[PDB]
């Protein structure tokens, strides 16, 4: 029954931040392409005292589309991912999934 306290602690912890980048994320329609998603994710990585770890896949799809994943080194850890036509696009959609996972997480 410990992990109930763990999941509530993590929800309160990543709702306890005071970043304006999170508010800019929340109000903006995040289906927009104008925002620098990988760079903003690195900014929030430097902001909230952890490592964003971009790791590519070693195995392309049956459709030949590249896959990337993002490790959000919190306690517990977030894992997000993206699949894009390039490694840049796979990392872009992976950093995207990281940001709506935070927006899902930071919605108070």
């Amino acid at each position: 029954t410990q992990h109930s306290n763990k999941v509530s602690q993590f929800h309160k912890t990543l709702k306890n931040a005071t970043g304006k980048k999170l508010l800019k994320l929340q109000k903006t329609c995040l289906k927009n392409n104008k925002i620098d998603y990988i760079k903003l994710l690195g900014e929030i990585a430097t902001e909230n005292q952890f490592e964003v770890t971009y790791v590519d896949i070693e195995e392309k799809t049956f459709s030949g589309q590249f896959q990337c994943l993002v490790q959000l080194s919190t306690l517990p850890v977030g894992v997000c991912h993206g699949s894009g036509p390039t490694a840049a696009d796979a990392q872009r959609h992976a950093a995207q999934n990281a940001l709506e996972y935070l927006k899902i997480m930071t919605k108070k």
Partner: protein, 1581 residues
């Protein structure tokens, strides 16, 4: 907590006895059980005609490890058994002639018959294992084709089959009906429905069956976004291409490329499960499920060693974090203040949940069991119901629990499998409290596990097996019961499913033998409920308890369920149906046998009657009448109990409490008097090797002065003993004084002054703080000194007596130097005198002895030491005292013993190394104070007048003054017992551990994992079909299902988702109306005797009746109503260790008071010998004193009532009450041996158990000398009447008084205690040829004759002792559990004496430990198996046979042995009881087959029980571990077992007061406790 008991798995046995039958059960254990029981039950009929009993199976020959059935039947019942391993040559020598059961393959049976080795007429019973297979059908088809069917029914054996449970065989319904037809025509049998399902459906009523439809979920924002989240994670995980070649790329790890698991399959399980939970139950259910999956998946993160596995498991955990955040906001977006969340809860609940909730709303005694075929589904359903019960005020009245079918694998992780079992335990114990209601199970509660009545049963999953649907139906017992299946347009196929299973039910119940009464017969009973008179044993009581027709079957079922027994034996009534056709009217007639434990064993036959239910009500009414007639029912009509029964009333005299009973009581908290000479003749002097003092030996008879006894009371004759003083071994005898002298008063004053000087200053027994008077009526003992004559006589020495009168104050004082100037010297004066050093410490002087006269010793000689030159210088410097003369030689002195108890007539010289030569209370102190050896001066040592040799005679004898007060009480006990007797006259271990664990687990192999095999084949397999054809019978059910479909669609079942004279005339249409009007009269209610009179009139007017044998009633109703079928269904010896040595009755004095005074000695004093030497025989005699009496007085009452009689009469409270009546505690001494304090020659608080330990101890006094017999007379003196009592008048015999004679009454009635009656055989001859059955049953007992080594006279007590409590086919005798009841006390007494009478002479605590370690029920089972008592026993009860098969596997793969059993004894200072207890029961037979002769039992049992008891004797259980168990006020507490890291080792802690805590390791609890005690002893020396 009541129900309706049947003989389930035993109707199968009955129907397996008459008719060719095929049985359908699930376990393979119950198939082997019913198979073994049927082979032994037909074995007697096989053995008389020398036939061959065959078990046909196809799981034979798979292992050289023995097959299960071969194991069962070779070493668990009577039969010598052969199994054919698949590649032996099948020897033809004696494998069927001198072997009863052959378990064969059907091709082996084909080889056996086609070679003409065996005749089918010599084949008794064949049971065909797993005949529901088509492949087994293919083997058994030519066996019936060539051999079985061409044999005539005159030449046929009995055919039984075993089948998988055909109510869910792997077949559509046309194959099912074709299968039932094909098997019932092929195997020549009848199919049988009866399983536990069929039992709870037959005699518990069927619930109302519903299908309830559920509306689909109406998806919204949150649900669709959750579906988007899960489909996103699913699309990414299926978008993976996983390849360990493309990740690891390790060519050298080909084994590890496949051993590394997929990182996807547990993400697949979690995400598929959350998908399904959303898809059906909803997003709230998905939320709680996802939270619980997060609980387990973070544990899987901790467990995970690899890298991509950790990546994907962290991804799954992140998804769960997400889903909790989405559902948490969307369920908290409704959570404003003043808002109830329950509307949103029910809203996001699917209408599957809402429909469940209105189903639960309809139940404002709720008992709801809810299935679901998934465990986390049960957790989330639990969580919904918990949140509902903690929020909904409508549904606030529930207490909900759950469970799982995920017992973990014990080969890896059993520690939480224990917690799984503990969880199920705590849930069920809260459930059956009658204070808790709602359960949410899984398929763990499907079969095997039994749950009480539970009215509302909701199946979540649509059933895919029959068993779950119908067993959920069966868990709904309490009518009105509601079996509701939920469904969310598959309603068509579910209605079709209930139609399929409904025809499966109606093809079950039609294929029974026994039937339930339909609603018509219920209505007929309801109509006729008042037309028959209410039978009352007390009809005068208006508000008395009544038994009508209607409640009589309930009361007979209660009588069968209130007689107590094992939980492995099932006891129930046995009615049968008999059809009699009279006067154009069909009549059903029920007979009614009560089982063999009840002593009504004659059949009760009913009267003919038009229907089933009315006839059954009448037959059970007859049973209630005759059972109250005998007395097996009481006046209040409940069945008898162990505490609700009282025996015959003059025996109840021992159970009224005492005035001291009305620190809990009963628990552990001038006269010529008699003269004799005390002859002390030295027989063996002390050896010079044992003469550690290095002095001369001083014999007692070298002087001519001795002593004598002068008493007014009689002195008995005793055998000669030997006092072992420091001088050696002295034989002590009493010479008969030829002279008897009249008393002289002043010479008695001389004697008394001499005794005062002796017991004050010589022997010093009379201490201060004292009063004493040696002149009283109670004893007149005068111990006097005499002088031996030169002619051999011993004349009285009045000279020394008057000398001691004038000098009874011989006291050295401050001797002046002038008298020691004048003091002379002579060797004869100190030749044999006592020397007295006067110069220091005069008030408490010490007296020393003369040892050697040395002419070379002088005070002028050199002092042995450089401290002083001479003895003069040494004495003068150290004390300032002057020795007058130094010319004389000096004296060698000897120091006295510092201990009175030097007599102890068996050993003091061997006991002399114990304590350093009387322990030196003063010798070591004085030799420390004087340093150099005591060479003393004759001038400083004056003469004591008591001679040295007379002093050495004086120290052997004394301290008898309380012993004379002690050995009068013992002789008084002898006096009253011979007064009321007639007899007598008035004038490595770690290697061992690993080997036994390996052997135990890997050689059991049929543990409770067989129920798990049933579990893993339970809902999954349900297979096997033969064929189907296109016959119209299939088309027949193609309307029947269809019309059943209409029934399901017309019953309201599917739910849309939005004249008493005519009463008697119908009662008796075959009895004419005129006679009924004659018998009516004013009597409005006809008694049963009236219908008996009508039947007696009618059988007198036609004498030819017809008969009928059908149904669940047995052919074991048998002889007393059948087996002749005559239409009468209307009414009715080594002398070494001899127990019967028996010294002659008249001519023996009785109890010699020596052993009485032994038994009058408390162990609180523990003066050498204590009462505990004989107390342990007393209790273990007194059982066999009482029980045989309490067996033979009440010879036909079931034994558990007698057990309460034993437990109240051999109580320590009971023996304490008896000793209160006899007052022995003041006659016994519980004070220490202190002459100062508690020595009163002419209060000792006693524990209440010790008084009991007193009383039975007295029994030992009579128990060698009289033999066993006369102590019973003492028991007859004691007030427990253990002999049959013959009341008489004054016979007046003149040769002798009769043994057993009592005191003359005031009305001159003479009471004679004759011995027990030579008993009646139990052969209650209701049957004409019961002796023919008595020798029919016991084929094969000549081996039981030779192996046991005893020949019986009449086998009546043996085949009582060969009858289990559930063994109803035998109808001569009772169960064996009356010869338990006497066999336990007989072998208890025999073994307790052979422990006591052993020449090695074990200690009292050793005697208790050797009782509780030499013998328990385990060694009874072990030597039972060694003597083949498995191979000779009879029993018909379920569960017991598989349990004791595992136990005898423990004996098998070990091969009998002593090792495992004495090992478990070593933890015992149990898997069966019954096979242990049989060695008691046969023992009771040889108690009364041989007419109460214990010698017969012992000489028979010796050559069989020798090496075990010499092994337990050579194991030496005589350790100080028992004094470490004692020496414990607070100083040896033992902690609880604490299991260590490996589990197979325990550490036991022992805490010791003010000395610390010690801990010991071991392979279990008990060896750890032993090692902890050994460590406590090793560190506590």
């Amino acid at each position: 907590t009541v129900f309706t008991p049947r003989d389930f798995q035993v109707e199968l046995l009955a129907t397996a006895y008459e008719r060719n039958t095929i049985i359908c059960l699930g376990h393979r254990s119950s198939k082997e059980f019913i198979a073994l029981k049927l082979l032994q039950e037909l074995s007697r009929r096989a053995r008389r005609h020398g036939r061959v009993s065959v078990y046909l199976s196809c799981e034979v020959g798979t292992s050289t490890e023995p097959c299960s059935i071969y194991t069962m039947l070779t070493h668990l019942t009577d039969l010598r058994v052969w199994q054919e391993q698949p590649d032996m040559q099948i020897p033809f020598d004696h494998c069927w002639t001198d072997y009863h059961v052959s378990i064969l393959r059907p091709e082996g049976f084909l080889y056996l018959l086609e070679t003409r080795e065996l005749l089918l007429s010599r084949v008794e019973l064949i049971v065909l294992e797993d005949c529901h297979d088509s492949a087994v059908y293919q083997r058994i088809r030519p066996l019936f084709e060539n051999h079985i069917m061409p044999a005539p029914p005159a030449d046929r054996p009995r055919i039984l089959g075993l089948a998988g449970p055909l109510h869910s065989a792997g077949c559509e319904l046309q194959q099912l009906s074709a299968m039932l037809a094909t098997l019932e025509q092929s195997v020549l049998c009848q199919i049988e429905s009866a399983s536990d399902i069929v039992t709870v459906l037959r005699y518990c009523s069927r619930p109302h069956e519903y299908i309830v439809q559920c509306a689909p979920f109406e998806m919204d924002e949150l649900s669709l976004v959750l579906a988007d989240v899960l489909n996103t994670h699913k699309s990414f995980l299926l978008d993976h291409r996983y390849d360990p070649y493309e990740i690891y790329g390790t060519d050298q790890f080909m084994d590890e490329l496949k051993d590394i698991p997929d990182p996807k399959v547990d993400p697949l399980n979690v995400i598929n499960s959350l998908l399904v939970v959303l898809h059906e139950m909803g997003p709230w259910c998905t939320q709680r499920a996802a939270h619980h999956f997060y609980q387990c998946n973070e544990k899987l993160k901790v467990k995970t060693p690899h890298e991509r596995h950790y990546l994907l498991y962290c991804l799954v955990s992140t998804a769960l974090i997400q889903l909790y955040s989405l559902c948490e906001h969307a369920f908290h977006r409704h959570l404003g203040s003043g808002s109830d969340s329950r509307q949103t809860i029910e809203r996001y609940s699917s209408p599957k949940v809402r429909r469940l909730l209105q189903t639960l709303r309809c139940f404002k005694t709720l008992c709801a069991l809810i299935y679901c075929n998934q465990n986390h589904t049960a957790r989330v359903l639990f969580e919904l119901l918990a949140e509902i019960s903690r929020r909904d005020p409508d549904l606030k009245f529930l207490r909900c629990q759950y469970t799982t079918d995920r017992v973990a694998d014990p080969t890896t992780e059993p520690k939480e499998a224990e917690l799984e079992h503990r969880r199920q335990e705590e849930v069920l114990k809260r459930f059956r409290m009658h204070d808790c209601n709602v359960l949410i199970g899984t398929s763990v509660l499907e079969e095997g596990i039994d749950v009480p009545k539970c009215n509302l049963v909701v199946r979540w999953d649509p059933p895919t097996t029959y068993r779950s649907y119908v067993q959920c139906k069966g868990r709904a017992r309490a009518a009105p019961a509601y079996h509701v299946i939920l469904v969310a347009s598959t309603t068509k196929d579910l209605v079709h499913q209930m139609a399929q299973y409904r025809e499966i039910e109606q093809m079950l119940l039609s294929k029974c033998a026994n039937t339930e009464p339909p609603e018509q017969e219920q209505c007929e009973a309801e109509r006729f409920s008042a037309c028959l008179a209410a039978y009352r044993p007390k009809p005068h009581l208006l508000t008395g308890a009544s038994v009508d027709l209607g409640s009589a079957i309930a009361l007979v079922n209660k009588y069968c369920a209130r007689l107590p027994s094992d939980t492995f034996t099932k006891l129930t009534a046995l009615w049968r149906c008999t059809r009699n056709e009279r006067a154009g009217v069909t009549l059903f007639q029920y007979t009614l046998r009560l089982p063999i434990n009840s002593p009504l064993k004659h059949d009760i036959v009913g009267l003919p009657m038009p229907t089933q239910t009315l006839a059954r009500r009448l037959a059970a009414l007859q049973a209630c009448v005759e059972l109250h007639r005998i007395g097996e029912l009481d006046d209040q009509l409940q069945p008898i109990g162990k505490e609700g029964f009282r025996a015959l009333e003059p025996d109840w005299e021992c159970f009224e409490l005492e005035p001291e009973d009305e620190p809990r009581p009963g628990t552990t908290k001038g006269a010529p008097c008699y003269l004799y000479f005390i002859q002390l003749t030295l027989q063996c002097p002390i050896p010079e090797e044992q003469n550690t003092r290095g002095r001369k030996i001083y014999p007692p008879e070298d002087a001519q002065q001795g002593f004598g006894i002068l008493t007014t009371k009689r002195i008995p004759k005793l055998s000669a003993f030997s006092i072992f003083t420091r001088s050696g071994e002295v034989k002590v005898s009493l010479e008969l004084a030829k002279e008897r002298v009249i008393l002289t008063s002043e010479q008695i004053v001389c004697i008394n002054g001499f005794l005062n000087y002796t017991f004050t200053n010589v022997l010093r027994l009379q201490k201060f703080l004292m009063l004493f008077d040696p002149d009283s009526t109670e004893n007149c003992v005068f111990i006097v000194p005499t002088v031996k004559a030169p002619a051999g006589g011993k004349h009285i020495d009045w000279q020394f007596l008057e000398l001691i009168q004038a000098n009874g104050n011989t006291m050295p004082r401050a001797v002046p130097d002038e008298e020691r100037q004048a003091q002379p010297f002579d060797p004869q004066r100190f030749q044999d005198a006592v020397v007295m050093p006067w110069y220091r410490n005069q008030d408490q002087p010490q007296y020393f002895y003369v040892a050697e006269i040395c002419p070379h010793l002088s005070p002028l000689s050199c002092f042995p030491g450089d401290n002083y030159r001479t003895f003069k210088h040494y004495y003068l410097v150290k004390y300032g005292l002057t020795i007058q003369n130094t010319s004389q030689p000096l004296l060698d002195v000897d120091h006295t013993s510092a201990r009175l108890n030097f007599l102890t007539p068996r050993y003091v010289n061997r006991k002399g190394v114990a304590l350093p030569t009387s322990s030196e209370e003063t010798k070591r102190a004085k030799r420390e104070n004087l340093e150099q050896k005591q060479i003393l001066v004759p001038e400083l040592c004056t003469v004591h007048p008591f001679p040295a040799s007379l002093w050495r005679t004086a120290v052997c004898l004394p301290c008898i003054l309380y012993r004379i007060n002690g050995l009068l009480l013992a002789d008084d006990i002898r006096k009253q017992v011979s007064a009321d007797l007639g007899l007598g006259r008035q004038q490595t271990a770690q290697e061992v551990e690993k080997r036994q664990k390996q052997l135990s687990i890997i050689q059991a192999t049929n543990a409770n994992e067989r129920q798990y095999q049933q579990t893993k084949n339970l809902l999954i397999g349900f297979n096997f079909k033969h064929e189907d054809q296109k016959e119209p019978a299939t088309i027949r059910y193609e309307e029947s299902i269809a019309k059943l479909k209409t029934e399901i669609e017309s019953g309201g079942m599917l739910v849309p988702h939005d004249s008493m004279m005519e009463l008697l005339k119908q009662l008796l249409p075959y009895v004419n109306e005129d006679v009924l009007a004659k018998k009516l009269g004013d009597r409005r209610e006809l008694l049963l005797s009236d219908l008996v009179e009508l039947n007696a009139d009618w059988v007198a007017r036609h004498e030819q009746e017809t008969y009928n044998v059908m149904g669940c009633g047995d052919s074991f109703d048998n002889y007393n109503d059948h087996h002749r079928l005559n239409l009468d269904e209307k009414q009715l010896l080594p002398a070494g260790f001899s127990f019967d040595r028996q010294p002659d009755l008249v001519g023996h004095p009785g109890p010699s008071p020596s052993i009485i005074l032994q038994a009058l000695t408390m162990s609180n004093a523990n003066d050498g010998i204590n009462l505990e030497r004989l107390e342990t025989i007393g209790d273990s005699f007194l059982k066999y004193a009482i029980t045989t009496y309490l067996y033979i007085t009440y010879e036909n009452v079931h034994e558990g009532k007698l057990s309460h009689l034993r437990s109240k009469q051999v109580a320590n409270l009971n023996l304490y009450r008896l000793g209160r009546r006899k007052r022995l505690g003041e006659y016994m001494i519980a004070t220490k041996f202190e002459p100062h304090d508690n020595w009163l020659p002419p209060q000792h608080s006693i524990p209440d158990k010790s008084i009991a330990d007193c009383v039975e101890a007295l029994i030992g006094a009579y128990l060698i000398e009289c033999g066993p017999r006369g102590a019973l007379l003492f028991m007859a003196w004691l007030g427990v009447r253990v002999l049959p009592i013959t009341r008489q008048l004054d016979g007046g015999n003149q040769e002798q008084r009769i043994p057993g004679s009592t005191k003359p009454n005031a009305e001159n009635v003479v009471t004679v205690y004759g011995a027990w009656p030579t008993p009646r055989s139990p052969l209650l001859h209701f049957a004409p040829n019961a002796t023919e059955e008595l020798d029919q049953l016991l084929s094969g007992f000549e081996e039981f004759e030779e192996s046991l080594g005893y020949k019986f006279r009449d086998r009546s007590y043996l085949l009582q002792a060969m009858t289990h409590a559930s063994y109803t086919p035998n109808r001569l005798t009772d169960c064996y559990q009356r010869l338990e009841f006497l066999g336990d006390a007989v072998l208890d007494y025999l073994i307790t004496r052979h422990l006591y009478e052993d020449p090695r002479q074990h200690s009292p605590g050793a005697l208790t430990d050797l009782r509780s370690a030499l013998v328990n029920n385990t060694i009874f089972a072990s030597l039972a198996v060694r003597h083949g008592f498995h191979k000779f026993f009879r029993h018909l009860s379920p569960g017991l046979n598989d349990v004791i098969d595992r136990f005898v596997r423990i004996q098998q793969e070990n091969g009998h042995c002593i090792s495992e059993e004495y090992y478990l004894l070593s933890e015992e200072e149990e898997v069966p009881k019954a096979l242990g207890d049989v060695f008691e029961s046969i023992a009771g037979a040889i108690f009364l087959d041989s007419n109460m002769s214990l010698d017969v039992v012992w000489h028979v049992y010796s050559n069989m029980m020798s090496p075990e008891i010499e092994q337990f004797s050579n194991s030496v259980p005589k350790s100080p571990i028992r004094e470490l168990l004692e020496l414990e006020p607070e100083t040896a507490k033992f902690g609880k077992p604490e299991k260590l890291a490996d589990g197979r080792r325990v550490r036991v802690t022992v805490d010791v007061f003010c000395k610390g805590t010690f801990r010991g390791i071991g392979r279990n609890y008990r060896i750890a406790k032993c090692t902890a005690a050994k460590c406590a002893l090793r560190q506590l020396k």
